[PDB]
Amino acid sequence: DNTTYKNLQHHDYSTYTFLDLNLDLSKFRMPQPSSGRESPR
Amino acid sequence: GGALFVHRDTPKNNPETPFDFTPENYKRIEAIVKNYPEGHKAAAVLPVLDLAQRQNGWLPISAMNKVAEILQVPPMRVYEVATFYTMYNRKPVGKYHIQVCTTTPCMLRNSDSILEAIQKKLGIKVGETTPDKLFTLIEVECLGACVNAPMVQINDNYYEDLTPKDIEEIIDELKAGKIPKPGPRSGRFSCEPAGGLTSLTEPPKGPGFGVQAG
Amino acid sequence: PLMGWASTADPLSNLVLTFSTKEDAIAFAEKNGWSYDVEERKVPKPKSKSYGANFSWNKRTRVSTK
Amino acid sequence: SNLIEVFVDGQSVMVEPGTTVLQACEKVGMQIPRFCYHERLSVAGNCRMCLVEIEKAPKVVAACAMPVMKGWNILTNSEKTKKAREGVMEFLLANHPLDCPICDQGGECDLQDQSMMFGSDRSRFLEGKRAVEDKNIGPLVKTIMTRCIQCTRCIRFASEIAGVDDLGTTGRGNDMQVGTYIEKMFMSELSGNIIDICPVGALTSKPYAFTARPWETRKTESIDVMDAVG
Amino acid sequence: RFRGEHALRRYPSGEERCIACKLCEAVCPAQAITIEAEPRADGSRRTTRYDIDMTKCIY
Amino acid sequence: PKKTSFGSLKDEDRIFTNLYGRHDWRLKGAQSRGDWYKTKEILLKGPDWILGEVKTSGLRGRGGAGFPTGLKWSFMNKPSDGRPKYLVVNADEGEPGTCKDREIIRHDPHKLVEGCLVGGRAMGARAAYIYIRGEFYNEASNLQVAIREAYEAGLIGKNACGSGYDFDVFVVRGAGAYICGEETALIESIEGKQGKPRLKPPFPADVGVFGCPTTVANVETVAVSPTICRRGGAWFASFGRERNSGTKLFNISGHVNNPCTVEEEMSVPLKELIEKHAGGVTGGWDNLLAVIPGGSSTPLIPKSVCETVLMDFDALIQAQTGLGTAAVIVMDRSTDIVKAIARLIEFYKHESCGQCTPCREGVDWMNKVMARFVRGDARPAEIDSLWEISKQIEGHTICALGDGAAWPVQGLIRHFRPELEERMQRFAQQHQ
Ligand SMILES: Cc1cc2nc3c(=O)[nH]c(=O)nc-3n(C[C@H](O)[C@H](O)[C@H](O)COP(=O)(O)O)c2cc1C
Ligand code: SF4
Ligand code: SF4
Ligand code: SF4
Ligand code: SF4
Ligand code: FES
Ligand code: FES
Numbered sequence A: 001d002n003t004t005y006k007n008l009q010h011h012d013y014s015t016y017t018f019l020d021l022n023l024d025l026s027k028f029r030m031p032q033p034s035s036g037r038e039s040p041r
Numbered sequence B: 001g002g003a004l005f006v007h008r009d010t011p012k013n014n015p016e017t018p019f020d021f022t023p024e025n026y027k028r029i030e031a032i033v034k035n036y037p038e039g040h041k042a043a044a045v046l047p048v049l050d051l052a053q054r055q056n057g058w059l060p061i062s063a064m065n066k067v068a069e070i071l072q073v074p075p076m077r078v079y080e081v082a083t084f085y086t087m088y089n090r091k092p093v094g095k096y097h098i099q100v101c102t103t104t105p106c107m108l109r110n111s112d113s114i115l116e117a118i119q120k121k122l123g124i125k126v127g128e129t130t131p132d133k134l135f136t137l138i139e140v141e142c143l144g145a146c147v148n149a150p151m152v153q154i155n156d157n158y159y160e161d162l163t164p165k166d167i168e169e170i171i172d173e174l175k176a177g178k179i180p181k182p183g184p185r186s187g188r189f190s191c192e193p194a195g196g197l198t199s200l201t202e203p204p205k206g207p208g209f210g211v212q213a214g
Numbered sequence C: 001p002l003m004g005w006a007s008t009a010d011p012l013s014n015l016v017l018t019f020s021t022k023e024d025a026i027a028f029a030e031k032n033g034w035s036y037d038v039e040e041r042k043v044p045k046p047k048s049k050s051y052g053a054n055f056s057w058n059k060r061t062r063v064s065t066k
Numbered sequence D: 001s002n003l004i005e006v007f008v009d010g011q012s013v014m015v016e017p018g019t020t021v022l023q024a025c026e027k028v029g030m031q032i033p034r035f036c037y038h039e040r041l042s043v044a045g046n047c048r049m050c051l052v053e054i055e056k057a058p059k060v061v062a063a064c065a066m067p068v069m070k071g072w073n074i075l076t077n078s079e080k081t082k083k084a085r086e087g088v089m090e091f092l093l094a095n096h097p098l099d100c101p102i103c104d105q106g107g108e109c110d111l112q113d114q115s116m117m118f119g120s121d122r123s124r125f126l127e128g129k130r131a132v133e134d135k136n137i138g139p140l141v142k143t144i145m146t147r148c149i150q151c152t153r154c155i156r157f158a159s160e161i162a163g164v165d166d167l168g169t170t171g172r173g174n175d176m177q178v179g180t181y182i183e184k185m186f187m188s189e190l191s192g193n194i195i196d197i198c199p200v201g202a203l204t205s206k207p208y209a210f211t212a213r214p215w216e217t218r219k220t221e222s223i224d225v226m227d228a229v230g
Numbered sequence E: 001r002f003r004g005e006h007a008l009r010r011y012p013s014g015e016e017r018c019i020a021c022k023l024c025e026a027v028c029p030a031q032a033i034t035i036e037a038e039p040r041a042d043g044s045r046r047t048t049r050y051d052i053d054m055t056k057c058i059y
Numbered sequence F: 001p002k003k004t005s006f007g008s009l010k011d012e013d014r015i016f017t018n019l020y021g022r023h024d025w026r027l028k029g030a031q032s033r034g035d036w037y038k039t040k041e042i043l044l045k046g047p048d049w050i051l052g053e054v055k056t057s058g059l060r061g062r063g064g065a066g067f068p069t070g071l072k073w074s075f076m077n078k079p080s081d082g083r084p085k086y087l088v089v090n091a092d093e094g095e096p097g098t099c100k101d102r103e104i105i106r107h108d109p110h111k112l113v114e115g116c117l118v119g120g121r122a123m124g125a126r127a128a129y130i131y132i133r134g135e136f137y138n139e140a141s142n143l144q145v146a147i148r149e150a151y152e153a154g155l156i157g158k159n160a161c162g163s164g165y166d167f168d169v170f171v172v173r174g175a176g177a178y179i180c181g182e183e184t185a186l187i188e189s190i191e192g193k194q195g196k197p198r199l200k201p202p203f204p205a206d207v208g209v210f211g212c213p214t215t216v217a218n219v220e221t222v223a224v225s226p227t228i229c230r231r232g233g234a235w236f237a238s239f240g241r242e243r244n245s246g247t248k249l250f251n252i253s254g255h256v257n258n259p260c261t262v263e264e265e266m267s268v269p270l271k272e273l274i275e276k277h278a279g280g281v282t283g284g285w286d287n288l289l290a291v292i293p294g295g296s297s298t299p300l301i302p303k304s305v306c307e308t309v310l311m312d313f314d315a316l317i318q319a320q321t322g323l324g325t326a327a328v329i330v331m332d333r334s335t336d337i338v339k340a341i342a343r344l345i346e347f348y349k350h351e352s353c354g355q356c357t358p359c360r361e362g363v364d365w366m367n368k369v370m371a372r373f374v375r376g377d378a379r380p381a382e383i384d385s386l387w388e389i390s391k392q393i394e395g396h397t398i399c400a401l402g403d404g405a406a407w408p409v410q411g412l413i414r415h416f417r418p419e420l421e422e423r424m425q426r427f428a429q430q431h432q
Helices: A008-012 A017-024 B023-033 B042-055 B061-071 B075-084 B111-122 B164-176 C022-032 D021-027 D079-094 D110-117 D153-162 D191-197 F027-032 F039-045 F047-057 F069-077 F100-107 F109-123 F134-152 F185-190 F219-230 F234-238 F270-275 F313-318 F337-350 F357-375 F382-393 F400-431
Strands: B096-101 B135-140 D004-008 D011-015 D051-054 D073-075 D141-143 D169-172 D175-178 D203-205 E034-036 E049-051 F086-090 F127-132 F214-218 F247-251 F261-265 F288-292 F329-332
Touching: A008 F134, A017 B023, A017 F134, B023 B042, B042 B061, B042 B075, B061 B075, B075 D169, B096 B111, B111 B135, B111 B164, D004 D021, D011 D021, D021 D073, D051 D079, D079 D110, D079 F357, D079 F382, D141 D191, D153 D191, D191 D203, F027 F109, F027 F134, F039 F047, F039 F109, F039 F219, F047 F069, F047 F109, F047 F219, F047 F234, F069 F109, F069 F214, F086 F109, F086 F185, F086 F219, F100 F109, F100 F134, F100 F219, F100 F247, F109 F127, F109 F134, F109 F219, F127 F134, F127 F185, F185 F214, F214 F219, F337 F357, F337 F400, F357 F382, F357 F400, F382 F400
Parallel strands: B096 B135, D004 D073, F086 F127, F086 F214
Antiparallel strands: D004 D011, D051 D073, D141 D203, D169 D175, E034 E049, F247 F261, F288 F329
């Protein structure tokens, strides 16, 4: 029950890492549907 | 309207002004677009244009047209999205974009003193980019971090429970270039009661109690 | 030549006569003695507008900007 | 068989399952005052003048996009409705210029018609009256955007029918400008027709300009040339 | 409040105060008025021919 | 059962551990703290048991909506169609004095994600978006890290928790607008078009994100829901009056020593909420002027009322002010409340969209009128004009924001009217 704030690691984010983690989340996920068309136009 | 900070138009000066994404950044955009069902692909306009403002501190109209090209959507939707939302700045700002909540219990918390102190310590009026560069001052409405005493924002950071002296401290730390610890200060580390650390003081229960009889 | 207001000998130019039904138009024309020509009445064609069809999944109809 | 009984002022009428409220009132002769709705254009909730009360229902529903279940009784003249119309008309007339002398549609514009035949007789709200930068578009369309009520018609038309997709809205709250953001010329076939759709004097005919005035002119049936469509 | 003859007025630094808006012609119970308005060089609108028949005019 | 006594809290029976940023933030920390335990058995146990579990709990929605969750999530049980289903979790927190979603999503991500999975399998959704206020970059990045932990562990994704069902999750940052947090316009902000709310007759349930059936739910609802399934139904229903049962966060702001965040029983005396959790009202209990319950959209509560009024949806409706997001703010007597609420109206004027003329005009009015009251240069008869403005706005517009902008002024008018005309009059004197 030591009391210390342990999310201090979040101070380490430059402004990329969100999207870069999105890149690191590539695959891992089901292919999403194609609807009927390529674009609604 | 009659009362506005800046109007919204492109009068001049950036018809062709060069803007290009970085190849790794094309990889990133591809990764983003993979997160939406096909047949739409227009949902990515907002995140991709976010990204544009991310690698380039402010987006010229060539960035809007460029995103419209990448996603093959009519550009007027791109301009529309660019104007309707607060994040996107269509005019260049400095390296550091200062944002203060002037509305409500931040306002009730003396934050006006914070604003005035900033204007004096930097030496300029509101809404004007400082001489030289890298400091801009605009007040924004509620940012959501509230119980923590009046908050100021720099780029992707939250400085909470801020007194004027510490405001000066942060600002000068940015003059040197050393970015202070993001988290709130003067106690209250990560959104707590200052006095008691009350409510739950106990060791959290393990993966028990879930009997459910099933 | 003095002013240029429009002028005519067309005493009947400015008349208009409101009728409830076409049968009354042909009736008053026949009775009153001068030849006539009828145009058929037209109406808006009944339509189906479903607001939801703006947002539909695969259908080509989708409202940009709304 | 795929028909529905729905009362209007206690007068039943049989309508199709999914025709709108405004149509259902059209059938018996009620024309509910409106702006953004148009026969050729997809529905939107912008004008808010279409509000009408349905009894037993606490809130007022917008007659443009509301589908009609069975057994709705649509009270058009119920007090709550008339108060709603007076309200909406008031908020519209809040920020509007006084152009009726100079404005081209003075003999026509539906703000005057519906203003008299529905809305309240006296305005309020002294300090106010926002203004908008006007934007030149084509040689055909003279444009004063201060008179714009921001009713989205021109947008929906340009998008769906004209197909150009170059018109939109940019802003929030009081300040929303309707038109090209980049100050591009907008010209196309069928483009001129937009000056008929703008319900107020915001858009008008540049060459027709100031010459005439609606009540003074004598309308005459005719046909067209220059196109084989007759 | 006496009613004499029909003088047009203009602003200080005379603008031809008439806007051309056609009202005075529209309410004329003798119909005697004429207004034809072509937008002039400045883009503001004035009247080309604004006429009265004092004969027809009932004052 | 639980009699009129409420506001006495029992630790270790709470919901959110770590809410103050303690202990271990990981799948391992949250793992040992009870998150993601037996959860496979929930998902394989079937949707109907989950739905009936939530309805048995009888819990109520969040964000001030107050609607029962079991129904909203029960709509999606329709026989499946050739179009996919989604679960849209609303991470936006708008309105001042709140902090509601921020602290949760920072310090306990895996509980939110696990809620997303349980709800998705419950209603049959394919994937779960989470739309977060774009201000939260660091925060939502932490969320990214935790989700990545879930995929690497094989905890979600294909055959989540090794079960016979696959549920992906996506996360989208916000573009920084208040109305993006609204149930409907959220859908189209996801769609990439500028966020403006849809008319209600099409429901989000019937036609949702990308035109496919989906629901919208707040971080509190979704995040607490799986543990709601693991607490046994009526257990959660033990707390609070049977109308509105369970626990909810209360984020105390305004003027009190130690403004902070706690989780309490649904029903609590507001006085106790101030005394025994966050500090005390600065200057004593008698120094308070008025208290704004829940979100900023809610009308004022005067002293003699808030003293006796507890915290409940229905009970606050008896107080005439519906409950907001439950994050309450208090006001010193010394402050000028007219300036405070006026500034709040300025917040509403700056955040709104231009579809409905009634807000984009009326809210302009109430801005300028309230500013005039701040300077007090109006005339006494005009306050009732401001009233009828608020009424004619309310109920006539698409989203609740328009309605949400009508209530505060009305509140200020009801209780504090006699406070105005002395400022009116002293402007008459001082100015003339
Ligand atoms: C004006 C307005 C503001 C809203 N602000 C928020 C907000 O800050 N956070 C949020 O999660 N939802 C917000 N919402 C949407 C509500 O969460 C939604 O109506 C409902 O509560 C979602 O269902 P739930 O109660 O099951 O979560 C807002 C809605 C409106 C109309
Ligand atoms: S738009 Fe209509 S109400 Fe406005 S000035 Fe023109 S005629 Fe008058
Ligand atoms: S320009 Fe005319 S048609 Fe377009 S939104 Fe404005 S009032 Fe409506
Ligand atoms: S047209 Fe007639 S009413 Fe209008 S400004 Fe000229 S004189 Fe006056
Ligand atoms: S009330 Fe205003 S903010 Fe809400 S949907 Fe209508 S136009 Fe938009
Ligand atoms: S027609 Fe219903 S909103 Fe305009
Ligand atoms: S009130 Fe200033 S951040 Fe919410």
